[PDB]
Design a binder for this molecule. Sequence first.
Ligand SMILES: OC[C@H]1O[C@H](O[C@H]2[C@H](O)[C@@H](O)[C@@H](O)O[C@@H]2CO)[C@H](O)[C@@H](O)[C@@H]1O
Ligand SMILES: *[C@@H]1O[C@H](CO)[C@@H](O)[C@H](O)[C@H]1NC(C)=O
Ligand SMILES: [Zn+2]
Ligand SMILES: [Zn+2]
Ligand SMILES: [Zn+2]
Ligand SMILES: [Zn+2]
Ligand SMILES: [Zn+2]
Ligand SMILES: [Zn+2]
Ligand SMILES: [Zn+2]
Ligand SMILES: [Zn+2]
Length: 233
Amino acid sequence: HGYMYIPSSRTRLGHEAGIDSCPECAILEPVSSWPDLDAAPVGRSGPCGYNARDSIDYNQPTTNWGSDAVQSYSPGEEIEVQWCVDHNGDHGGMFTYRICQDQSIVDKFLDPSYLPTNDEKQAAEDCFDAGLLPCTDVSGQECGYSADCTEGEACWRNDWFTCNGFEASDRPKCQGVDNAELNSCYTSIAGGYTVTKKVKLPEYTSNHTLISFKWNSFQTGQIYLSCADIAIQ
Ligand SMILES: OC[C@H]1O[C@H](O[C@H]2[C@H](O)[C@@H](O)[C@@H](O)O[C@@H]2CO)[C@H](O)[C@@H](O)[C@@H]1O
Ligand SMILES: *[C@@H]1O[C@H](CO)[C@@H](O)[C@H](O)[C@H]1NC(C)=O
Ligand SMILES: [Zn+2]
Ligand SMILES: [Zn+2]
Ligand SMILES: [Zn+2]
Ligand SMILES: [Zn+2]
Ligand SMILES: [Zn+2]
Ligand SMILES: [Zn+2]
Ligand SMILES: [Zn+2]
Ligand SMILES: [Zn+2]
């Protein structure tokens, strides 16, 4: 249970606008989430997420999200990205952020009068995967391998970020990355913890595009997706 927090995702805005009672609940399941992190179809979840709790499809703007960029950045800027994990749903695993560099694809997700089909969601997901923002593009950022993976498996990749080990004595799981205080970010079930990293934005301009967060579980078959509206100018 988690969602993207900084920049402010559509899911965060759905919470703050009073629409989404459980932002951390928007989940892609059942799926195979491990060890192949990208094979599972995204279905109705798409790159922005679908929350079954209040029947919210974040792939479509509404009055409450998706209308405009929440934040503006520069091409190639190294930026803070943060997600929020619920205390009762800290799965460990691996996560990443992606930007699709095909504006015409993205445009179908920016139209309050249009809901992308599942096929359009998948074509967009493939563009996002091509646009993954590697951990290793940020000088000095330590980009390790998961304690839940072995070399030779499709999870053995340090373009994705990893949470800390599930079984670690000290600072386990995703909460252990920042070791922040409880309620450092909002979740509805048991309160949230921040999970913070840096990414290098692409050398690409847009007045309105998306960054999509993806978090895959290792111990259960579950993926969490969110997306934030951004500008790169
Ligand atoms: O407090 C009002 C809120 O209650 C329920 O949502 C809870 C949910 O039951 C918990 O599992 C967790 O997600 O916190 C939620 C927010 O309090 C109702 O389902 C919801 O409709 C209502 O707004
Ligand atoms: C953003 O919109 C302004 C006004 O139309 C325009 O001048 C500029 O080129 C646009 N930027 C991009 C990256 O398309
Ligand atoms: Zn969960
Ligand atoms: Zn709040
Ligand atoms: Zn794959
Ligand atoms: Zn600029
Ligand atoms: Zn605890
Ligand atoms: Zn295009
Ligand atoms: Zn294995
Ligand atoms: Zn086990």
